[PDB]
Design a protein around this nucleic acid. Sequence first.
DNA 1: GGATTACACCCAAGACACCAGGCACGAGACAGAAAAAAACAACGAAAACGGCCACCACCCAAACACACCAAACACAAGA
Length: 51
Amino acid sequence: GGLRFGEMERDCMIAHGAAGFLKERLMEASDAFRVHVCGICGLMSVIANLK
DNA sequence: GGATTACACCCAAGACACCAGGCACGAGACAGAAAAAAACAACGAAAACGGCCACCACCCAAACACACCAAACACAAGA
Ligand SMILES: [Zn+2]
Protein backbone atom coordinates (compact mmCIF):
# COMPACT_ATOMS: atom_id res chain seq x y z
CA GLY A 1 0.00 0.00 0.00
CA GLY A 2 0.73 3.70 0.20
CA LEU A 3 1.03 6.12 3.10
CA ARG A 4 -1.77 8.49 4.06
CA PHE A 5 -1.02 12.19 3.43
CA GLY A 6 -3.71 13.28 5.87
CA GLU A 7 -5.28 16.60 6.82
CA MET A 8 -2.57 17.77 9.24
CA GLU A 9 0.09 17.07 6.61
CA ARG A 10 -1.92 19.34 4.33
CA ASP A 11 -1.95 21.99 7.07
CA CYS A 12 1.85 21.81 7.32
CA MET A 13 2.26 22.04 3.52
CA ILE A 14 -0.13 25.04 3.50
CA ALA A 15 1.87 26.71 6.28
CA HIS A 16 5.01 26.18 4.20
CA GLY A 17 3.27 27.75 1.20
CA ALA A 18 4.25 24.82 -1.04
CA ALA A 19 1.24 24.77 -3.35
CA GLY A 20 2.85 22.84 -6.19
CA PHE A 21 4.01 20.05 -3.89
CA LEU A 22 0.51 19.76 -2.43
CA LYS A 23 -1.10 19.56 -5.88
CA GLU A 24 1.47 16.96 -6.93
CA ARG A 25 0.96 14.79 -3.83
CA LEU A 26 -2.80 14.83 -4.18
CA MET A 27 -2.98 14.36 -7.97
CA GLU A 28 0.05 12.76 -9.63
CA ALA A 29 0.97 10.63 -6.61
CA SER A 30 -2.67 9.54 -6.25
CA ASP A 31 -6.01 9.17 -8.10
CA ALA A 32 -5.53 11.67 -10.92
CA PHE A 33 -8.21 11.42 -13.61
CA ARG A 34 -9.43 13.29 -16.76
CA VAL A 35 -13.20 13.98 -17.27
CA HIS A 36 -15.15 15.99 -19.83
CA VAL A 37 -17.73 18.57 -18.74
CA CYS A 38 -20.43 20.27 -20.78
CA GLY A 39 -19.57 23.91 -21.38
CA ILE A 40 -23.28 24.78 -21.26
CA CYS A 41 -24.82 22.69 -18.46
CA GLY A 42 -21.63 22.01 -16.48
CA LEU A 43 -22.58 18.39 -15.79
CA MET A 44 -20.27 15.46 -16.40
CA SER A 45 -22.80 13.97 -18.83
CA VAL A 46 -20.58 14.43 -21.92
CA ILE A 47 -20.18 11.36 -24.14
CA ALA A 48 -16.56 11.36 -25.37
CA ASN A 49 -15.34 8.93 -28.03
CA LEU A 50 -11.66 9.73 -28.22
CA LYS A 51 -10.74 7.36 -31.06
C1' DG B 1 -35.34 15.76 18.98
C1' DG B 2 -29.65 15.32 16.75
C1' DA B 3 -24.19 15.84 16.49
C1' DT B 4 -19.36 15.73 17.48
C1' DT B 5 -15.40 13.37 20.58
C1' DA B 6 -6.49 13.11 18.10
C1' DC B 7 -2.94 11.66 14.14
C1' DA B 8 0.06 8.00 11.69
C1' DC B 9 1.47 2.80 11.45
C1' DC B 10 1.58 -2.89 12.48
C1' DC B 11 -0.65 -7.65 13.16
C1' DA B 12 -4.44 -11.46 13.64
C1' DA B 13 -9.45 -13.64 13.09
C1' DG B 14 -14.38 -14.67 11.12
C1' DA B 15 -18.11 -14.23 7.40
C1' DC B 16 -18.90 -13.21 2.46
C1' DA B 17 -27.85 -14.60 5.00
C1' DC B 18 -31.34 -19.50 5.24
C1' DC B 19 -36.25 -20.41 5.81
C1' DA B 20 -40.62 -19.28 6.55
C1' DG B 21 -45.61 -16.73 5.67
C1' DG B 22 -47.54 -13.68 1.74
C1' DC B 23 -49.34 -13.16 -3.97
C1' DA B 24 -51.81 -15.96 -7.34
C1' DC B 25 -54.77 -18.69 -7.96
C1' DG B 26 -57.80 -22.13 -5.68
C1' DA B 27 -62.58 -23.32 -4.16
C1' DG B 28 -67.25 -22.43 -0.22
C1' DA B 29 -71.01 -18.61 2.51
C1' DC B 30 -73.45 -14.70 4.51
C1' DA B 31 -72.93 -10.61 3.74
C1' DG B 32 -72.72 -6.36 0.03
C1' DA B 33 -76.22 -5.90 -2.69
C1' DA B 34 -80.52 -6.97 -6.25
C1' DA B 35 -85.65 -8.98 -7.44
C1' DA B 36 -90.40 -9.85 -5.89
C1' DA B 37 -95.07 -10.02 -3.47
C1' DA B 38 -98.61 -9.33 0.15
C1' DA B 39 -100.48 -6.90 3.63
C1' DC B 40 -99.94 -1.77 3.83
C1' DA B 41 -102.39 3.33 2.30
C1' DA B 42 -105.89 5.29 -0.76
C1' DC B 43 -110.27 5.46 -3.75
C1' DG B 44 -115.15 3.80 -6.59
C1' DA B 45 -120.07 1.61 -5.51
C1' DA B 46 -124.17 0.07 -2.44
C1' DA B 47 -127.06 0.36 2.50
C1' DA B 48 -129.33 1.96 5.86
C1' DC B 49 -129.06 4.55 10.02
C1' DG B 50 -127.84 9.02 12.19
C1' DG B 51 -128.96 13.98 11.35
C1' DC B 52 -132.37 18.13 10.50
C1' DC B 53 -137.10 20.33 10.72
C1' DA B 54 -141.90 19.55 13.03
C1' DC B 55 -144.63 18.92 16.85
C1' DC B 56 -145.05 19.48 21.03
C1' DA B 57 -145.65 20.11 26.74
C1' DC B 58 -143.87 20.95 31.21
C1' DC B 59 -140.03 23.59 33.72
C1' DC B 60 -137.19 27.70 34.23
C1' DA B 61 -137.08 32.94 33.57
C1' DA B 62 -139.11 37.69 34.09
C1' DA B 63 -142.57 41.16 36.35
C1' DC B 64 -145.17 42.69 40.44
C1' DA B 65 -145.10 43.43 44.89
C1' DC B 66 -144.17 42.41 49.82
C1' DA B 67 -141.11 43.23 54.15
C1' DC B 68 -136.17 43.49 55.23
C1' DC B 69 -131.74 45.12 55.34
C1' DA B 70 -127.43 47.86 54.03
C1' DA B 71 -126.22 52.46 53.83
C1' DA B 72 -125.34 57.77 53.65
C1' DC B 73 -125.59 63.46 54.85
C1' DA B 74 -126.06 65.82 59.02
C1' DC B 75 -128.11 67.60 64.06
C1' DA B 76 -126.68 66.57 67.67
C1' DA B 77 -123.40 65.14 70.95
C1' DG B 78 -118.56 64.96 72.23
C1' DA B 79 -112.44 66.11 73.15
ZN1 LIG C 1 -24.59 20.21 -21.30
